[PDB]
Amino acid sequence: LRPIATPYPVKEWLQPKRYKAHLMGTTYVYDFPELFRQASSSQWKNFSADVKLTDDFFISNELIEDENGELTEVEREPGANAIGMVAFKITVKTPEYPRGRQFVVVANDITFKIGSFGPQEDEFFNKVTEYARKRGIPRIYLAANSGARIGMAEEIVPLFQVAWNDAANPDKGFQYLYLTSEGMETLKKFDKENSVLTERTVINGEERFVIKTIIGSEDGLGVECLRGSGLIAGATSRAYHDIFTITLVTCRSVGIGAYLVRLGQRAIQVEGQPIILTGASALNKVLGREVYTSNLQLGGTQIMYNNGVSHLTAVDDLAGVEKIVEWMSYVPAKRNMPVPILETKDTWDRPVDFTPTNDETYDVRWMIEGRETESGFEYGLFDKGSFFETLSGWAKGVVVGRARLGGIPLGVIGVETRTVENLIPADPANPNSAETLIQQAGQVWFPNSAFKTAQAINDFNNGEQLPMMILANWRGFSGGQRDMFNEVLKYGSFIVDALVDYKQPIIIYIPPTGELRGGSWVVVDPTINADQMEMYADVNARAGVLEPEGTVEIKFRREKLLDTMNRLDDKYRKQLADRERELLPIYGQISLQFADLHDRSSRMVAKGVISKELEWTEARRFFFWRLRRRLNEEYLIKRLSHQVGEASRLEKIARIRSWYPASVDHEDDRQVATWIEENYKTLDDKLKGLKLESFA
């Protein structure tokens, strides 16, 4: 016992495994539920400081397999785990779910066989994933591992013999490995006969048992660990489409560990804990030369957070747990439950204060969440303090996060107007390599930002099941050689695929000072998914195939411009060339103005390509009710889908709207949401009555 004379018992002595986990720079597995309790309690303090919490607000129950391999809840002492994988069922009362919400936490025990994955850990991880999926509840994975387990048939080590070419000269080589009769008998005696595959031959009177294959009695030596890794990789790929999956890299994640991080998509990486495939030491042995000095050069935050493999970084385990808990606050309690509404001091009924100007640089985050000013806080489009930005280390030209609109949680995609830089590191493995700094202008989709946009859309859709708003402001895709060669077309196409798959309301809004041109409009147009998408343009927004300079270059050429000079200039109507030179700069400005006059939201409304033209200051009030009306109609569309089996979305929606009182303006979002919420139980009775269904 060390240290002596402490006020309370030495927890690292009662369970020496806690000390081992600590010695490896990570939280001991059994102490993670306590971190979730601390993080959950902080959520309450930040929400309503006056709330009196009691320990019954949070329950953690360890899940273990029974005799028939079925998961069951247990209350046992920490460190009793017979396998290197542990799980907990968490039931927490949160500000968004005051009566309780549930989730599962799976974790590697780094103190158990270095946190390696053997067949038993793989089958348990899979069982826990299926458990989460069956219930529709989130699956949190805490990664702290050495990858797939490795071994050798340790029983064959003291028994094997070598068929030397020349016994007196070992250096001269060997023919094969073999066992003797006494070697064979040793295996027979310990019931390990099938540990080797032998072939008997007689050499100079003595019978040799030529080892043809070594199998081993102990399970979890090789391929069986690789099979199990495959099983859990496929399980995670499926879980991502079904439930909310998130991973916290808590010590290091190797091989299958690294793949699991990616397959669950949403990842929080603790500073200094690497996500690696092959370690730096092993790589130097493969390369010959001592190339790398740390695993952080391969899988640190400097790699993974900059990549977008790590969505967020955390200073320590508790910060990571706090970020999981914060992220989950935007997510339904379970699959297909409504998005969790959480109204704060910042009500829907107010104008938007922060307004962008064409002559001034702005951070898009100011439009999203507002900004502090010497003269007071300028509120933005979304609820004050609700913006939770993710993928913040990668493709900084797009800003992705979760936010709340008068309490309604949603995914937000905004455009960074400021030029962004990123540094490609020099790989020590190549002596003829140097670090490159890449600049990328704002309001242009590059391969990385196109990938980030698609990624964000998919992550809001799967598991999170959130509605979305895109504050669309792109001049197009980068069509230059570098970006075309770097497959910008592929990444842009992922955006289309991501929108086709979206199952919740989408709002595309071209903001004030914003533009949506050529290829950028194509990839985000509401006809991609008419069931979910809707588009709005601000009165101060712009849109067209080309920018005014482009339109003029193709459609308002010199002959058209000179004819305009002939019409509008008294002097024009060699003495022409001198007036041409004088007039040309201002007539170029006239044609640019003529072109820009087509690019207005009024033309967008006239041509029916936008639902409405909006005023930014009034957008919060408009979108709050539009979204709230939309969530309600979508709820009723889903109920109707059960009650028929075969009807189109247009048919379902028209039927639901036929139920509204004749006095109800179908175009009034507030009136429509107010009537539905006043009649959920009445509409339910209407639906239960429609159960006069027998259709072939």
Identify residues 445-504 at the interface with ligand RCP (CB under 6 A): 475-476, 478-480
Q: Restricting to residues 77-106, which ones interact with its own copies according to CB under 8 A?
A: none
Other residues' Cβ atoms within 10 Å of the Cβ of residue 358: 7
Q: Which of 628, 615, 632 has its CA nearest to residue 406?
A: 628
Choosing from 341, 426, 441, 586, the residue that interacts with ligand RCP (CB under 6 A) is 441
Rounded CA separation 483/253 (Å): 32
Q: Among 222, 272, 385, 588, which residue sits at the site for its own copies (rule: CB under 8 A)?
A: 222
Q: Which of 309, 381, 456, 470 binds its own copies (CB under 8 A)?
A: 309
Q: Where are the beta strands (DSSP E) in 477-518?
A: 506-510, 515-517
* C-alpha to C-alpha distance for 257 and 317, rounded to whole angstroms: 17
Q: Which of its own copies, ligand RCP, none interacts with 53 (beta carbon under 5 to 8 A by kind)?
A: none
Which two tokens mark 408? 């309604």
Residue 138's binding partner out of ligand RCP, its own copies, none, with CB under 5 to 8 Å set by partner kind = none
Q: What is the DSSP letter of 477?
A: B
Smaller CB distance to its own copies: residue 222 or 385? Answer: 222
425 binds ligand RCP (CB under 6 A): no
Q: Is 144 exposed, middle or buried (0-12, 13-18, 19+ CB in 10 A)?
A: buried
| Near its own copies in 177-206, by CB under 8 A | 177, 194, 197
Nearer to ligand RCP, 18 or 149 (CB): 149
User: Could you tell me which stretch among 97-105, 404-412, 522-530, 641-649 binds its own copies (CB under 8 A)?
Assistant: 522-530
150 is in an annotated binding site: yes
CB 467 within 8 A of CB 494: no
Which of 45, 73, 174, 418 lies at the binding interface for its own copies (CB under 8 A)?
174
Cα 481 to Cα 420, 446, 450, 478, 486, distances in angstroms:
19, 12, 16, 9, 8
Q: How far apart are CA 680 and CA 616, in angstroms?
A: 32
Q: Is 256 in the site for its own copies (CB under 8 A)?
A: yes
> Do the Cβ atoms of 211 and 196 come closer than 8 Å?
yes
d(CA 147, CA 254): 5
User: Rounded to an integer, what distance in angstroms lies between the CA atom of residue 58 and that of residue 33?
Assistant: 9
Least distance CB 72 / its own copies (angstroms)? 24
Which residues precede a break in the chain, with C-to-N distance above 2.5 Å?
A: 573
Give me the phi and psi of 214, to 5 degrees please: -110, 120
Establish whether 519 is an annotated binding residue.
Answer: yes
The CB-of-206 to its own copies minimum distance in angstroms stands at 16
Binding pattern to its own copies, positions 258-297, x when CB under 8 A? xx-xxx-----------xxxx---xx-x------x----x
In whole angstroms, how close is the CB of 222 to ligand RCP at the nearest point?
12
Indicate which single residue of 237, 278, 529, 617 sits in contact with ligand RCP (rule: CB under 6 A).
Answer: 278
Q: Which is nearer to ligand RCP, 40 or 473 (CB)?
A: 473
Residue 282 lies near ligand RCP (rule: CB under 6 A) = yes
Contacts of 492 (CB under 8 A, 6+ apart): 445, 450, 477, 519, 523
* Segment 454 to 483, residues that bind its own copies, using CB under 8 A: 476-482
**Which of 326, 406, 464, 407 lies closest to 46 in space, CA to CA?**
326
Helices 680-689 + 619-642 axis angle, to 10: 30
Cα within 13 Å of Cα(131), Cβ side: 24
Residue 550 sits in the site that holds ligand RCP (CB under 6 A): yes
Q: Exposed e or buried b for every residue in 88-105, given b needs 16+ CB within 10 A?
A: bbbebbbbbbeeebbbbb
Q: Least distance (Å) from its own copies to the CB of residue 392?
A: 17
487 contacts its own copies (rule: CB under 8 A): yes
* C-beta closer to its own copies: residue 604 or 631: 604
257 contact choice in its own copies, ligand RCP, none (CB below 5 to 8 Å, kind-dependent):
none
3-state SS of 274-287 is: CEECCCHHHHHHHH
- Residue 430 touches which of ligand RCP, its own copies, none (Cβ within 5-8 Å per kind): its own copies
State the burial class of residue 378 (Cβ atoms within 10 Å of its Cβ: 0-12, 13-18, 19+): middle
Find the binder of its own copies among 48, 357, 361, 527 (CB under 8 A). 527
* Total residues in contact with its own copies, by rule CB under 8 A: 137
The reply to whether 547 sits near ligand RCP by the rule CB under 6 A is yes
Residue 148 annotated in ligand binding:
yes
Only one of the segments 21-29, 426-434, 670-678, 682-690 lies at the binding site for its own copies (rule: CB under 8 A); that segment is 426-434
Residue 374-413 contact track with its own copies, rule CB under 8 A, x = bound: ----------------------------------------
Please report the DSSP string for 232-271 in residue order. Answer: HHHHHHHHTTTS-EEEEE-S-EETHHHHHHHHT-EEEEET
Q: How far apart are CA 118 and CA 232, in angstroms?
A: 11
602 binds, among ligand RCP, its own copies, none (CB under 5 to 8 A by kind): its own copies
> In whole angstroms, how close is the CB of 465 to its own copies at the nearest point?
19
Joined together, the tokens standing for residue 403 give 């936010």
| One residue of 118, 183, 299, 393 binding its own copies per CB under 8 A | 299
Does residue 492 bind its own copies (CB under 8 A)? yes
Binding residue ranges for CoA: 252, 555, 557
Binding residue ranges: 148-150, 252, 519, 555, 557
Give residues in contact with ligand RCP (CB under 6 A): 278, 282, 285-286, 441, 444, 475-476, 478-480, 517-518, 546-547, 549-550, 553-554
